[PDB]
């Protein structure tokens with residue numbers, strides 16, 4: 001690697017590095033899905049190399065647009081983007097401060113990253129719809145160090161507790177216990193770190209970032225169990241605020257409802273936009289910048305139409321109260337028959 005060389009060109013035999021393998025808190029069965037695990041690994045390796053590169057240049061002074069474009073450019077090159085066979089699984093989240101998730105700049109956003117900002121870089125790659133969903137928090141001021149450590153620890157605790165037959169509610173209880181064991185001091189004020197209760201991890205399906213099961217990050221959830229063969233995004237969020245998020249700011253993220261089938265549309269602009277979405281994203285999430293890049297314009301009303309029709313769903317930024325600070329750490333795990341693989345694990349986090 002120079003990053004510019006596609007992951008597949010770095011591993012000629014098409015065999016990609018495994019992530020961290022763990023015994024749980026069939027070998028034939030495991031091997032029968034090797035092509036699947038392999039695709040996840042190719043996407044995870046791209047994820048590892050992209051984030052390593054990002055960590056080397058992300059600095060206050062850069063615009064959020066500059067950051068996302070530079071990251072996405074690298075991701076496209078390393079994943080060897082190929083329509084729906086290989087590409088970006090979802091938009092680059094770079095949510096700031098009290099905003100925890102689902103913020104990526106739309107065209108014209110002049111927001112500049114600041115020294116005191118706490119930025120959640122949450123981005124995804126896929127090979128054949130096998131998605132790697134993984135994220136980390138970026139800071140420049142050491143005052144947030146303990147908050148970051150709390151969340152990193154909570155995420156690692158959820159990863160450790162996960163396993164075949166494990167009750168999702170137990171994973172959430174564990175995460176909360178660790179998260180809340182931390183106390184931090186920021187600008188002369190102290191806080192007990194709180195998990196964002198209405199935010200959660202979730203199962204992953206083919207071309208489906210949210211397959212239907214959720215991994216709570218607080219006690220009180222469902223006793224539904226994790227199952228052999230499932231794939232999960234284990235993410236946790238810690239906050240100095242209310243520990244609850246609400247929709248806020250302009251929406252940038254959108255995604256077709258996985259269950260909606262074919263819908264004949266005669267309105268020309270709306271029909272065309274749906275065609276563009278089906279061709280380029282299918283059921284994968286996208287953002288407005290990605291429509292712009294494809295040369296689309298005057299699409300906002302068509303997009304609203306699709307949302308109002310329930311064909312597409314909006315995913316607006318999720319933020320805690322003004323003045324609060326939020327952090328995130330996330331990994332994708334495979335519940336293979338023989339072991340638990342933290343496929344996106346790196347030497348970084």
Ligand code: MET
Nearest residue numbers: 090091122133253285315
């Ligand atoms: C709504 S697409 C962005 C999804 C995000 N990466 C998540 O972890 O849930």
Ligand SMILES: [Zn+2]
Nearest residue numbers: 122133134135
């Ligand atoms: Zn994510």
Ligand SMILES: [Zn+2]
Nearest residue numbers: 133201233235
């Ligand atoms: Zn996720």
